[PDB]
Amino acid sequence: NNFNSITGNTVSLPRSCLSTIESESSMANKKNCGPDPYII
Amino acid sequence: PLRDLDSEHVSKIVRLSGIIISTSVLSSRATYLSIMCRNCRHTTSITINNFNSITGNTVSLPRSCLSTIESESSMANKKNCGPDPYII
Amino acid sequence: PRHPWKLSFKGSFGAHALSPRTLTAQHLNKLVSVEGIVTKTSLVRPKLIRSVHYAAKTGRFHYRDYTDATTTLTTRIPTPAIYPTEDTEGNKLTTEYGYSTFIDHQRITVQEMPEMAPAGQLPRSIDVIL
Amino acid sequence: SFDRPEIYSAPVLQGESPNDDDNTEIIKSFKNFILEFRLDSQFIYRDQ
Ligand SMILES: [Zn+2]
């Protein structure tokens, strides 16, 4: 909701996958997705 | 004799006698392994002829994809495959 | 009596009948009909779709398919597969030009028509990939 | 869409004089030991 910034990505894609820190699923099937794994 | 081994014998050939208490099960070490990049799909082969090291991977999978540094293809289609991208 | 069939559209578009000035970000991911003038056209360039290679040691032909984001309407996970110069066993590959497929690609610029454009303002344009 | 450039070599000149600590000379001496050693009257390592 904020577009005030210029020459800056004040909001960007997260630097690592958010599945691990959330731990949403009980199974949770060392696995690392990598830096900047998200695709728009 | 086994108790007369010294630091002067380190990394040198020694002849020594004794009795054997245990023989472990056979482990499988890789001599030739063909590896492929995870997303890049670059194909590489690693040949290992040395197996003396214990408790250590003296030869391991490369930490980054080797396609970029080689630059073997003229097209070369910033793209980074990631840390440890290779799969045996 | 093999290439997949494509679709073209005609008729009234309503609110989607626009001009390069009238194109806004609310029209993104929507089918739009845009009238204007062509100002710039690029060189027609072939784009490699499938590369065919020959391994002389085994005497076999291999191939690799390439896609980009402009080919599909839906986004896909970008898997950039490099141009193969080895087979899986390490034998040298030679490119088989003429067995590979290249699809023609162009980019044009469509600016709003000088009679439908305001008389003092700088014109607005948009790139179209063909 | 071109292929690899290839790198290859061929021996032409004599080069520098061989050195005993060089790996190639050690390999050659080991090869000569394998081929030419005689225990009593036989090439034991070659036959082995
Ligand atoms: Zn790669």
Curated annotation (Swiss-Prot), chain B:
It is found in: Nucleus. Transmembrane segments: none annotated. Belongs to the MCM family. Present with 10300 molecules/cell in log phase SD medium. Early fractionation of eukaryotic MCM proteins yielded a variety of dimeric, trimeric and tetrameric complexes with unclear biological significance. The MCM2-7 hexamer is the proposed physiological active complex. Acts as a component of the MCM2-7 complex (MCM complex) which is the putative replicative helicase essential for 'once per cell cycle' DNA replication initiation and elongation in eukaryotic cells. The active ATPase sites in the MCM2-7 ring are formed through the interaction surfaces of two neighboring subunits such that a critical structure of a conserved arginine finger motif is provided in trans relative to the ATP-binding site of the Walker A box of the adjacent subunit. Component of the MCM2-7 complex. The complex forms a toroidal hexameric ring with the proposed subunit order MCM2-MCM6-MCM4-MCM7-MCM3-MCM5; loaded onto DNA, forms a head-head double hexamer. Interacts with CSM1. This is Minichromosome maintenance protein 5. The lineage of its organism: Eukaryota, Fungi, Dikarya, Ascomycota, Saccharomycotina. The chain holds residues 147 to 243 of 775 of the full protein.
Curated annotation (Swiss-Prot), chain C:
It is found in: Nucleus. It comes from the Eukaryota. Disulfide bonds: none annotated. Component of the MCM2-7 complex. The complex forms a toroidal hexameric ring with the proposed subunit order MCM2-MCM6-MCM4-MCM7-MCM3-MCM5; loaded onto DNA, forms a head-head double hexamer. Interacts with CSM1. Acts as a component of the MCM2-7 complex (MCM complex) which is the putative replicative helicase essential for 'once per cell cycle' DNA replication initiation and elongation in eukaryotic cells. The active ATPase sites in the MCM2-7 ring are formed through the interaction surfaces of two neighboring subunits such that a critical structure of a conserved arginine finger motif is provided in trans relative to the ATP-binding site of the Walker A box of the adjacent subunit. The six ATPase active sites, however, are likely to contribute differentially to the complex helicase activity. Belongs to the MCM family. Present with 35100 molecules/cell in log phase SD medium. This is DNA replication licensing factor MCM3. It comes from Saccharomyces cerevisiae (strain ATCC 204508 / S288c).
